[PDB]
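Work Package 4 report. The design task specified in the project plan requires that, given a folded chain encoded as structure tokens, an amino acid be chosen for each position. We show below one input record used in the internal validation round.
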């Protein structure tokens, strides 16, 4: 039986991409760049802060200095911090709170496996701090997803080996990170984006303790 569940933040617990979008839209409007709409936000999914800023500058074929590029990326981060003050328990994805309650009552460890520098603050905004046993130590993460580092760190933070854990993710890079950590991946999303080899669920409402137990026992063959 598994002893821990390692949670990714964006796309599993909540939608932080929406707040990243509002941050980028605020920056674009300030510097006078049109086109940062909902359809453009899809080109920013799973893309780094630097490459995302470049895509926004590309919308106006705008060239900036290395110093101004750094300043704009900083200004976006400041915008993001202001945007996330609005995160509330209403932001929690369906089924996640009940899963957290069920894991805690069954003495199964809960860890946050996120590359977010605002992870604990977001859990606090969502009233989820009491369910989390530990957050992955950023000092033990040398490389990001697809590298297994973050999931290995999350498992270790709750006192378990990755092999005794289940990892929940919405991205292909994150699924690969769980696989290489030794933990069992259960993905969330469309089969067109994630692939056949692992167990995938359409949405987070399917992430029940009953289902996690079933999948775990099935993969012990
Ligand atoms: Mg994610």
């Amino acid at each position: 039986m598994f002893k821990a569940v390692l949670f990714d933040l964006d796309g599993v617990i909540t939608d932080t991409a929406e707040y990243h979008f509002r941050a980028w839209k605020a920056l674009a409007e300030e510097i006078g760049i049109n086109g940062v709409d909902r359809q453009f936000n899809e080109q920013l999914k799973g893309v780094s802060r630097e490459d995302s800023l470049q895509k926004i500058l590309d919308l106006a074929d705008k060239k900036v200095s290395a110093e101004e590029f750094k300043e704009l990326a900083k200004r976006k981060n400041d915008n993001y911090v202001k945007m996330i003050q609005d995160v509330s328990p209403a932001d929690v994805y369906p089924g996640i709170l009940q899963l957290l309650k069920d894991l805690r009552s069954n003495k199964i460890k809960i860890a946050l496996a996120s590359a977010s520098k605002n992870g604990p603050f977001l859990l606090e905004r969502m009233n989820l701090t009491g369910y989390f046993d530990a957050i992955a130590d950023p000092a033990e993460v040398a490389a990001s997803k697809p590298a297994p580092d973050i999931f290995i760190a999350a498992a270790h933070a709750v006192g378990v080996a990755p092999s005794e854990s289940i990892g929940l993710e919405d991205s292909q890079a994150g699924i690969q990170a769980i696989k290489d950590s030794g933990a069992l991946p259960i993905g969330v999303g469309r089969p067109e984006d994630l692939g056949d080899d692992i167990v995938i669920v359409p949405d987070t409402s399917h992430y029940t303790l009953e289902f996690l137990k079933e999948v775990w026992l099935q993969k012990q063959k």
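The beta strands are 4-7, 109-112, 134-135, 165-169, 184-188, 199-201. Validation will be extended to a larger panel in the next phase.
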